[PDB]
Design a protein around this ligand. Structure first.
Ligand code: TRP
Ligand code: TRP
Ligand code: TRP
Ligand code: TRP
Ligand code: MN
Ligand code: MN
Ligand code: MN
Ligand code: MN
Lengths: 447, 447, 447, 447
């Protein structure tokens, strides 16, 4: 494989860096897997990434909203036609309500087609066997057989990735992204929800807006379909470097993209300034997210922003606040002020999930719904008060009727958790609770 | 002028009938005026009349609403670019609010381009001189000079008619019928109205529906312009018979239209079954209205419906209830039941104007706003209860800030009337009071 | 009537100038006619004039073509629904063929709604009576009764003007401007033309382009209707000054328009630099044409261009070459070179009509078809060679099957002329010969 | 896996049948591969198959054309982003020319995402090792190691299938299916082709039709993108039965689809009436093709049509004539007459490839371009003469500059073949020769 140009100087340097949360496995074998994946069809194409950069610039400048979400960890087992549908459906069903509430174009990103690699686990498990690190590295089975790290799982992940994107592209053009269809499903929610009497205000109001549209004779070019972009945490060195492709923009302008997804994002753990991922990200032309915890100082946030967005292109960087309901109001404002002052129009995104994960006195780990909302509530209160733009959210959900998060309209308590708990990692929002979340965030976008 | 076909047998018979409310003037002179007008360009064309019949069929079958209105009597003096604009603007500004409220296509008919002839006056005035009978017959001046009946005023009316339609067609294609522009004017009303705090519920709600439209990327083909159809009372024999033209529909299918307007309507006074107008109307292929008072018996309403709609074409006949706020609930239901049972899908239209005209203990004649609303309120209460469709309304308004009707948000009382009173005949709704009327009728269409 | 602003200084000065080709009539009476017409609805509105300026800028910059034409002189007698249709139809039927040939948007201007005033006649007739000077001044009858100059004919002209524009606006929205309909009529021409075997190349080719359009599933938003703008020679002082209106553009920017038409043009006779019309034209914000004969020197053409286009707004001025088939190649190139060099992007338009008018040894006056074509042929040869843009043409035609011009596919000779000759002034192209002209000009636009 | 309903009775019976051209491999292993593939995301979805049935009905009824084609056998090695692009590009580049020529919607089907299984080889090779039977069964390497039959290759094929469809869906929405872009590439062909002077007639003509489109202001909703459907020969029992899914149409109407592709087709070898494939095909709701050789008798063609299209749904069956240039005119007409008479509106498709395969006196096997054209030439001559509709073609091509077929504009002779020959099986058309084929078939569609 020959060199690009002046990137090779930078690329070699980028490999040199340490990478946290890597898998331990055979190197000679993993290099073969990579050189296989160096020639496959990509999951996405450069023009679609450009389209997302342009749409993400509008989010950065107050003209659009960002809905990101899906499974915490995709599993090969769960990557099926019925499950993918339900995630797409709930993502869209939310997006119609946020579109109305925000009075702006919602951009739909998804945790899909790549979100396999997982860091959150401690380095070793009880019983002396390695713990689950995603179906791209090892199996969920609690046996030394399955938990052994396997480079071949990278090809299985690429397979399952291209399967899922092929399906969302089909599902979206085939009209599960029909606007009238989605709102008819949202009435079925509000009618059959316990706390739907609260939300029926906005339900009727969206109903009216749609009937008004048809009354004005508005030709349904844009109403039959959507665009669901895709994303995952760029965790794994060999997989993400294998998906590097070299596109040539208009007038022969050459660039370097990671086409494993439209948008890649960096996690809390692999966040070092002189580590692989932040240097990888700054080299690739994709839009980029970056998770940010309470331990962030505004000094560091400006440092990230300078490296990841070195040309002040609005929407290139998303900064994903995940801080807990209590510490969001306190920590965030200083970060924004410093970042905005430095001349960077980033997308401010709320992740009210990975802040509020607590062990539920029941074996299982959960998040309380009321606390999840309260982090977003505070995320807006900071933006309203400072006079900056709430760019988006980054929730974790599923389209199955599962009981993993407490509270909500359903009244899910400690005792309800073992009844159905299908998640490979962090606890996801119930279908009921995902829609319910959107309606509340809509109300916050209005006021 | 040669004969059409089997129509000539019927046409001769139609002339034979007596016509009420005619002008007394020279016959030889008036026949020359007619034979001049027999060759001019028509005010409208057959294909547009067909378009209205098709759209009026949708009103008859519950799928659309009918907004009709404008000046009571157009005057040559008042037929000016600024006045016509303001009437068009308020007609459209209403139509956007009714469209939202009804959740259906509003069809916009106007009292314009022909509404000159006037019957309401008693046959002779005080002082022994003839009274005003519209600028198509005589002048407003109180002198035996001006009040003399003049056949030449028919050509002056045709001139002023083609002037006004030429302007609405231009105004509508030029973008005074822009949907975003109209609602921006409606916010200026609700902000600057006294009782706008009541209406700001629906104002924000329409605002949201429009921002939602732009958020969904909806291409503005249908949003920049409208269609304002035109109408007048077919009062005058010589003028309406001069505008008879013979069109040939698809596959050479020949028909006879009165192209003085898109839709002609019959008044309370010239309503006889064996009089000129009802026989004229049944011969012409235009859509047709018919005014109906408290003295109507359901027996007669079915007789009209049989003659005017002899082929059960839905939307061909409109039946215009004008009965007073008190007698609307009582008289109407029996008429609908009999008409619906006879197998006629007419358009049920409310005229809350020509029922409630009372002399205002001030010289001038007025209508009270609260009473006008209450006739429409009852018009809906009858339809809601019977389970039939409220097809439309037929208000009289102007786009000038005039004080002719009492009540409203403005608090217009007896003493306010002489301050500005520009109407040639019946008292019209203030700009403020026309918009205010629409918002209330919207609220009635929802519930 | 109060003053505009700094225009009044200029307006007074503009009146002061002598005006050629005026009518002699009562001044006190003509001032009443003018003060009547000062308050009527205009024939057009400012936003439509702005739209034309923007579209005419595209013609000036090589991106569009200009089709102007219609009757030489409209007559009140001829201003009828059937005649107007046929002129509109042939104007559009031409425009589809020119659109294809030019591979650009054709802009459709018409000699309609105002083209009554006529200058071409000598000042006095034989028999001592005044000669015909258009239905806006006097009648066609050869009697001292009718030929007397009548200010009231200005109001009759305004009436007939608003009649005709009301009809074209209706005819155009009602779908006589349907693109598939027009080409089906053009096949009927080519099939039934004698020389149609020459033109059937381009006929099939346009047929293919339309079927291709429907094959590509192209939504028919733009295909059902057109925009026919309107024009006349601004000849008559009192009529054109009566139609002056004051519009306020975006952000309250005030301007002065003559809304008797969209585009006014100046004739050969009333062309003086310090005469009324050139000073009138430079004061009004309308787009402007100017007729130009062989006697023009490039020195003068630059002088006109400086006065009429004082801000170098492209498309504001059209320069209408009418020079004869022989003298077009010789006279024109020097005019273009000087005008282009001076920094003026005007529209170069060919008028192959008013150059080639000769008395036909038969009483009547005619133009030979082959000579008419040859002036356009040379008009293109000049532009092809110089490398400038042929902006448009300015033919005179009618949609009746009349025999006024010699030659063509029909083989019209001297003896054929009295069979049907309906023109009030210059000889117009036959329906057959108008379409035939377009096909040839299309072939010239390709090569 | 539970039963559908009354299908299970029929499904069991369908398995019972013998299947020709199957692979010999471990059954227990191959059943695991199948039960894995029973739960994956499908390559396509039911609504898209319905869309194709509706579009294929229009082809059957003379309103549309069918362009099918691509690689003869896809190889995992060749299934790459650059190769897939070039095939898509040439498929579309052809489709624009056929769309114009046919004056109808071309429907674009592709040999992609599944076309791995191959029957054409004799049962055993020289050297005693098994011969190549497609990357879904074994490898191209000439070693007993690689040629061993491997059930795991079914999962590798599904992986590579979902990879490729994910890419065409992306490539098509991203604007490699832009109509103006494709024709700009077609001018580069005609300019740089040797025999392009023949084709420049239609090249300019398509250029004109596109400029005309932009001149008419036609909004580019439909012009930026296309729909490329997908197909392969349903050869392999375990793979096709694994992709059976159960969809529920509008109003809960249940059906059974094979979602390995949009359209499956049956080969010459596996064509028996009581064999697996014809009974499989008749059970699945997909549209269906069927290859047909010279040995077909009209008696049999009606028998097929009765079984495969048991409800006379037009466009459900495609009948693919592959007969050789000589025997096409002779054999075909009798088949059509009998089929049309039986009341079946099938799609008549020409496969001018698998008839004319001859060994090229050079080791390699080839087809002559002039002979390939002549089979289509005769295919049309039969339809023109009989007065039936030429529904489509089924060529085999690639977007690489390869030398596998003789003749064409390039002048490829025997000596040119080894220079570049990349095909795993039958010889494909050069990029130059694929475009050139389309232009000629366009000319045949006109006359
Ligand atoms: N195409 C528009 C409108 C739309 C269609 N389906 C949607 C579903 C959700 C939100 C918006 C939409 C958009 O993507 O915004
Ligand atoms: N053209 C649509 C929408 C529209 C445009 N302008 C309007 C003004 C009022 C109501 C609706 C409209 C209609 O006539 O209904
Ligand atoms: N609306 C487009 C296309 C069109 C419709 N009717 C036409 C008649 C002639 C030429 C073009 C057209 C235009 O005005 O150009
Ligand atoms: N969308 C239309 C037009 C079109 C777009 N791209 C194309 C490429 C080829 C042929 C047609 C098209 C179609 O599929 O037919
Ligand atoms: Mn998580
Ligand atoms: Mn009245
Ligand atoms: Mn002339
Ligand atoms: Mn083959």
């Amino acid at each position: 494989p020959p060199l690009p140009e002046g990137m090779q100087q930078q690329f070699e340097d980028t490999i040199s860096r340490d990478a946290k949360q890597q898998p331990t496995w055979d190197r000679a074998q993993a290099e073969n897997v990579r050189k296989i994946l160096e020639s496959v069809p990509p999951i996405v194409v450069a023009p679609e990434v450009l389209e997302l950069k342009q749409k993400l610039a509008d989010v950065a400048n107050g003209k659009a909203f960002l809905l990101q979400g899906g499974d915490c960890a995709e599993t090969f087992e769960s990557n099926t036609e019925p499950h993918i549908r339900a995630n797409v459906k709930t993502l869209l069903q939310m997006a119609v309500v946020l579109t109305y509430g925000a009075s702006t174009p919602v951009i739909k990103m998804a945790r899909i087609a790549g979100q396999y690699a997982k860091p959150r686990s401690s380095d070793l498990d009880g019983n002396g066997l390695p713990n689950y690190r995603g179906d791209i590295v090892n199996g969920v089975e609690a046996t030394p057989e399955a938990r052994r790290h396997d480079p071949a799982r990278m090809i299985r992940a690429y397979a399952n990735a291209s399967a899922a994107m092929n399906l969302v592209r089909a599902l979206t053009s085939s009209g599960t992204a029909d606007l009238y269809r989605l709102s008819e499903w949202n009435r079925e929610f509000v009618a059959n929800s316990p706390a739907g009497a609260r939300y029926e205000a906005l339900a009727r109001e969206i109903d009216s807006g749609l009937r008004f549209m048809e009354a004005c004779g508005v030709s349904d070019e844009s109403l039959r379909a959507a665009d669901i972009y895709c994303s995952h945490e760029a965790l794994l060195v060999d997989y993400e470097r294998s998906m590097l492709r070299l596109a040539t923009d208009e007038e022969g302008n050459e660039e370097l993209y990671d086409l494993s997804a439209h948008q890649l994002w960096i996690g809390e753990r692999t966040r070092g300034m002189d580590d692989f991922h932040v240097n990888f990200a700054s080299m690739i032309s994709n839009p980029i997210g970056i998770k940010i915890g309470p331990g962030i100082t505004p000094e560091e946030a400006v440092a990230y922003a300078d490296k990841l967005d070195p040309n002040f292109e609005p929407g290139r960087l998303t900064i994903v606040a995940r801080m807990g309901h209590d510490k969001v109001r306190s920590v965030l404002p200083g970060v924004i002020q410093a970042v905005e002052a430095s001349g960077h129009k980033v997308i401010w995104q709320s992740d009210p999930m990975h802040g509020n994960t607590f062990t539920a006195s029941n074996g299982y780990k959960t998040r309380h719904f009321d606390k999840v909302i309260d982090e977003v509530q505070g995320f807006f209160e900071v933006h309203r008060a400072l006079g900056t733009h709430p760019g988006g959210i980054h929730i974790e959900f599923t389209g199955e009727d599962v009981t993993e998060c407490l509270g909500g309209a359903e009244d899910i308590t400690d005792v309800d958790l073992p009844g159905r708990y299908e998640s490979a990692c962090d606890p996801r929002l119930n279908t009921q609770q995902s829609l319910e979340l959107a309606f509340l965030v809509a109300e916050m976008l209005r006021n």
